[PDB]
Design a protein around this ligand. Structure first.
Ligand SMILES: CC(C)SCC[C@@H](N)[C@H](O)C(=O)NNC(=O)c1cccc(Cl)c1
Ligand SMILES: [Mn+2]
Ligand SMILES: [Mn+2]
Length: 369
């Protein structure tokens, strides 16, 4: 029936009918030649094409509902004083529960990002990380869930000091702007131009210093594929970023990043995130430790991203060199933390959208953001 205070009932059991709640459904934005959408949500052939992938949309929805319930839960207890490990463990414990983890059929799409301050993304603690969340920290919670490879890439920013309020509002508004501009036949470079205009319309004051929010130029949104967090197309966030168009049936992660620094990220700190190259095929390996690790990765993650903590929990130890080998062989790719200049502040907001035949669905939309 209903769920417990501390989320523990799988989303699957909350909807015995196998039909999960849809996200925010929107009519596609007008074009300039009668190519709007007040006809799509209406067309008969479109309703057919759409209904044809109902099971797919349904898998995204089950993953999205798990995501909404997990983040609402996280927002109630995340507090300075907790270690980053404690935060990720508690979040992941709940995510595995509500998504009813079942090997590669259902589970966590990628590691729990909890990047701090100047670091914008790809940071999650490795074993032994003693980092503690602080009152003045600006933490980006970015985690994912999936059902049959249908990934929900969604994220928000956590703060405790009201001095970052306008900064968060700026990035949230920017992301929502990107979501509204998105649609079938829309040029990706136009979405980025739109996002940047809104983002830069915000000026903020933090600790006596004023800044015009800058989008992080080398970070962006992206299309999503089955078991493929990045399908190939990128949603810029600034301006001149390719006029390729979005297509019907595509799924996108509309994510924007705002910064008070240079607006550019670079690799920094110890790497924790890793993911098999989607285009690399079977590779025979004789090296004992390297062979075993690759098998563990194929069995547990496939082409989904993972982190060192997830290797530890599987009972693996002294796998670092084997992991480096796979990376050097190009079988696996490392994704180190991406950070702006020291002293800068970065914020993020992200949603997954479905470019359905009849409409645009912000499947991960919630009452929170
Ligand atoms: C580092 C990822 C493999 S783990 C997933 C992180 C996402 N939550 C984040 O929003 C994101 O999209 N990060 N960037 C990438 O995943 C990325 C960048 C360039 C090339 C490829 Cl294949 C993936
Ligand atoms: Mn993300
Ligand atoms: Mn993303």
């Amino acid at each position: 029936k209903v769920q417990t205070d501390p989320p523990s009932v799988p989303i699957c059991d909350l909807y015995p009918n196998g039909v999960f709640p849809k996200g925010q459904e929107c009519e596609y934005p007008p074009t300039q030649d009668g190519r709007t959408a007040a006809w799509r949500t209406t067309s008969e052939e479109k309703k057919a094409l759409d209904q044809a992938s109902e099971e797919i949309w349904n898998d995204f929805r089950e993953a999205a509902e798990a995501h909404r319930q997990v983040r609402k839960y996280v927002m109630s207890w995340i507090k300075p004083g907790m270690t980053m490990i404690e935060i990720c463990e508690k979040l992941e414990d709940c995510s595995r529960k509500l998504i009813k983890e079942n090997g590669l059929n259902a589970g966590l799409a990628f590691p729990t990002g909890c990047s701090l301050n100047n670091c914008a993304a790809h940071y999650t603690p490795n074993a032994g990380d003693t980092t503690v969340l602080q009152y003045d920290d600006i933490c980006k919670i970015d985690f994912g869930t999936h059902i049959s490879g249908r990934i929900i890439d969604c994220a928000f920013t956590v703060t405790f000091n009201p001095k970052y309020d306008t900064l968060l509002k700026a990035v949230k508004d920017a992301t929502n702007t990107g979501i509204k501009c998105a649609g079938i036949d829309v040029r990706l470079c136009d979405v980025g131009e739109a996002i940047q205009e809104v983002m830069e319309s915000y000026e903020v004051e933090i600790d006596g210093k004023t800044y015009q929010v800058k989008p992080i130029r080398n970070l962006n949104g992206h299309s999503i594929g089955q078991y493929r967090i990045h399908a190939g197309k990128t949603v810029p966030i600034i301006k001149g970023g390719e006029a390729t168009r979005m297509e019907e049936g595509e799924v996108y992660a509309i994510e924007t990043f705002g910064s008070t620094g240079k607006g550019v990220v670079h690799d920094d700190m110890e790497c924790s995130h890793y993911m098999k190259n989607f285009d690399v095929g079977h590779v025979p390996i004789r090296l004992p430790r390297t062979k075993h690790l690759l098998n563990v990765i194929n069995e547990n993650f496939g082409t989904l991203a993972f982190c060192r903590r997830w290797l530890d929990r599987l009972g693996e130890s002294k796998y670092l060199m084997a992991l480096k080998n796979l990376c050097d062989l190009g079988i696996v790719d490392p994704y180190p933390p991406l950070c702006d200049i020291k002293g800068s502040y970065t914020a993020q907001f992200e949603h997954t959208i479905l470019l359905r035949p009849t409409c645009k669905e912000v499947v991960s939309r919630g009452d929170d953001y």
